[PDB]
Symmetry: C3
Subunit: 332 residues, 3 copies
Amino acid sequence: DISTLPRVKVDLVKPPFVHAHDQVAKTGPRVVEFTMTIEEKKLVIDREGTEIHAMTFNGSVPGPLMVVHENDYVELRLINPDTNTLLHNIDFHAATGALGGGALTQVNPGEETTLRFKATKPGVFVYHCAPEGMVPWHVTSGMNGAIMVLPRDGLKDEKGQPLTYDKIYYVGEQDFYVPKDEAGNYKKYETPGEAYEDAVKAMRTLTPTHIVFNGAVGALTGDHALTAAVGERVLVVHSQANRDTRPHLIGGHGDYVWATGKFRNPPDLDQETWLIPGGTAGAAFYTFRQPGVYAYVNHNLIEAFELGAAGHFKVTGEWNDDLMTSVVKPAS
Amino acid sequence: DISTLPRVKVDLVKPPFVHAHDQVAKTGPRVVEFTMTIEEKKLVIDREGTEIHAMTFNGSVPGPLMVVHENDYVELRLINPDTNTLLHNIDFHAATGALGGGALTQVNPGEETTLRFKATKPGVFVYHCAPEGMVPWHVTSGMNGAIMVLPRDGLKDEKGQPLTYDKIYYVGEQDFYVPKDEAGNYKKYETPGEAYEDAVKAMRTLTPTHIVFNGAVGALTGDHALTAAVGERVLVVHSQANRDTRPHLIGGHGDYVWATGKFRNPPDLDQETWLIPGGTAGAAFYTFRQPGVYAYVNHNLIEAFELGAAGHFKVTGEWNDDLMTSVVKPAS
Amino acid sequence: DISTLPRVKVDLVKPPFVHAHDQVAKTGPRVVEFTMTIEEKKLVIDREGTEIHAMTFNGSVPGPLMVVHENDYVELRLINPDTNTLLHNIDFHAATGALGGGALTQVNPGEETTLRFKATKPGVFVYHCAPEGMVPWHVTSGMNGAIMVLPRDGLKDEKGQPLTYDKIYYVGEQDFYVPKDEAGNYKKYETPGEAYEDAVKAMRTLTPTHIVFNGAVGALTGDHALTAAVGERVLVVHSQANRDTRPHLIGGHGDYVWATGKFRNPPDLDQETWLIPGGTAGAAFYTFRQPGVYAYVNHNLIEAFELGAAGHFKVTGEWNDDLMTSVVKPAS
Ligand SMILES: O=N[O-]
Ligand SMILES: O=N[O-]
Ligand SMILES: O=N[O-]
Ligand SMILES: O=N[O-]
Ligand SMILES: O=N[O-]
Ligand SMILES: O=N[O-]
Ligand SMILES: O=N[O-]
Ligand SMILES: O=N[O-]
Ligand SMILES: O=N[O-]
Ligand SMILES: O=N[O-]
Ligand SMILES: O=N[O-]
Ligand SMILES: O=N[O-]
Ligand SMILES: O=N[O-]
Ligand SMILES: O=N[O-]
Ligand SMILES: O=N[O-]
Ligand SMILES: [Cu+2]
Ligand SMILES: [Cu+2]
Ligand SMILES: [Cu+2]
Ligand SMILES: [Cu+2]
Ligand SMILES: [Cu+2]
Ligand SMILES: [Cu+2]
């Protein structure tokens, strides 16, 4: 009887940050209430000023990470304002029935809907828009995110001992297929509707023009680099709603990795690089042991360094010479 | 001494259906006899009427699922009628030696051959034609299928408890590389031999023009949708002889998944999406919990919805509101 | 205190062969000294005589396999002679800190450097050059290899029992992106520097022109085929520094496979085909049971047979009819 369960309202935060939550559940099952507003907006995705008409949940690419526990109910109020122009919906890979909720959440501009589902399986899961006949277009325009369903007793290593993270980041990787004129220059349109046929043709090449973390080339760099300290335990959730990726932390490892994102399975140990299939979210746990700059990339290095799939960590603390040292510095 | 083992003759059925078999072996080892006839035929692969010269085992793309038990002998009589024009053979990834049987099964039109091999490893395995110097062409023209070698005591979960399926389907996913003229229109030829150089050039782009389930765009829809009931346990075998795929059941999960198809390994639990590498068969077990329509896709959603890699389940029975419900229906 | 540990100097050998080593460590921790000389050289990569300016560690593509044990120190003296023209460095995915050693190993032509790191995690790991702003170019020009860090007590099966290999081979798979003129012919340049902008454009297509084992089409064939005997236990280490691969032994299996290369994890059993993600090294153990020729391929069969990703084993010994036999040979 759901009416006797506690409700809690959660305010979502922008990726790569994640809303406050408990790892180990401090209450019984709850109904967890989220609200998201669909926003169609112009987005600049690279250093050259290339613009697309992005389709977003809550104004970001990716949409925000939702975090609940196993056997909670998720209640999502989804709003499509009349300033938008397209029909949207939502599919949760975490849910059971009705095309992930897709069949029940079709909202024209000016409408809203409230969906509830029970989070029966623990893991990280992709969510994405999926309107009938325009699925790939919506998803490759940025309309995806992820939900994390924690086990009620938190994460465990391969021996069943507890694993507790000190920080958590969410990296959404996005393939974009920006349409090109005859010579190879990117086209510009005034509305999402204008791009449609050109977008279908660009997608059919199966060759993205950009692959980015958090919505733009270099979004997770400089002032916006991810941070941590030597000694900290960091969980990095990574999603790709459409295409395979292979994350790698340059200078580090995935100590414990659930490459396909599902926590009832034991994690893979000591990974250098792991494969997250398109349509999946994955999670990697690392303990930092050296200070300095780290690059976190898609290890198709062309996709990383030419097409944009690269971010940075800045890590503070003490250097350990036992682990690594320059014996003789570069010299004639 | 094989001459003292029972023989049994099996008549194969068209995919996605699977010939009758016992999960748990009710006899000792047997020699299991199959016959297949190679058929070269014209096939219409999409709604636009695009035609290819397909190369088939037993008249279908994919070829039929063979099912035996561990330590059975498979005896396959393979017939190439004189109405065909090419040399064919067969390679079983389930077999040991002679290039999977490839070296011993070369049959010109007008010839036949009988091969026997012991099924020493349990799992689902790809079989495909592989004639010297034309391997990719034959395989990407549709000349592949799969064999399932069950453990003698049937399937087990990750704890070793029995898993029994109520139904089994076989989904063969096929990449096609139909050659294009200067403007992007599909070419047509009178014979398989005519297409050869154009086919090599199309393949070298590494970009398929179609990716289909069971031989055509929309083959597993409408009247030909897969069916089940709430409560039923369904095994879905999925093969791709040449290219990576990432299956996903929209509205469901892979409860138990052997993504690389080999049953001595424990299954992965609660998968949203899994990666079946090119040249592999995989198997996913799901128990339906909600009625309605489900889409079963390759979750590169472009490959699914634009290039054809999408099928449907129609599931009958009772709706469960605890799992999912619309609290407030789409409204102003 | 490193100064009291034994040192040992290892002379590296050309792939696919591997320097002599002990599986089970017969000493305590050591500092293991390697030297590599960077060589920029012209390389012919196919039967048509197509030439590239390759960037090599020690004159080969891939660079040589280094083999140490867990908790050894690796000390690498890396030399860039003044006959070269580019700045190079090295990143070890096996190491912790400073971008895998990348940050500490930048050597202009005429310089050398000596790096030391502790091999804290057991597995096979990729190493590759990664100079700031030219990472993909260096890696896809051939500047990668692998390091194997054995557990001190050698390899174990999924039950913890010892697995001992009789031979070990190293297969490096390389994607090349040779630039094409208007009509599709390969371009030629006098220096590496000349190709740069054309190389960036070729890479951005994400479509390689060649995919090879050991640096050329057909390098692991004929006189240079890998060999073994019926009964031998063979470890095949396989690396791809930039792009996904799916190895398959035609006529065989991966008895025990660590597809993502990390030995603290149990191996996957009875694999037909496995996925090694770009930026990873993997390892497969097989026991030969039949004599004859085997093809070892990337099982995207286009990549194998049209673009070059195929090698051979020649295996000697006794044929076993129980496993496989031709009952009726190809006949009218
Ligand atoms: O500006 N909206 O796509
Ligand atoms: O658009 N909200 O009713
Ligand atoms: O699904 N493309 O990696
Ligand atoms: O092919 N996906 O990186
Ligand atoms: O989804 N398996 O970690
Ligand atoms: O019609 N036979 O390709
Ligand atoms: O073609 N059968 O002999
Ligand atoms: O093998 N191509 O995914
Ligand atoms: O790249 N295969 O979907
Ligand atoms: O093939 N492993 O399920
Ligand atoms: O010949 N050196 O690229
Ligand atoms: O180039 N060695 O000093
Ligand atoms: O990373 N490309 O398979
Ligand atoms: O997509 N890599 O074979
Ligand atoms: O890296 N796992 O074998
Ligand atoms: Cu949408
Ligand atoms: Cu989906
Ligand atoms: Cu054939
Ligand atoms: Cu094969
Ligand atoms: Cu270099
Ligand atoms: Cu790397």
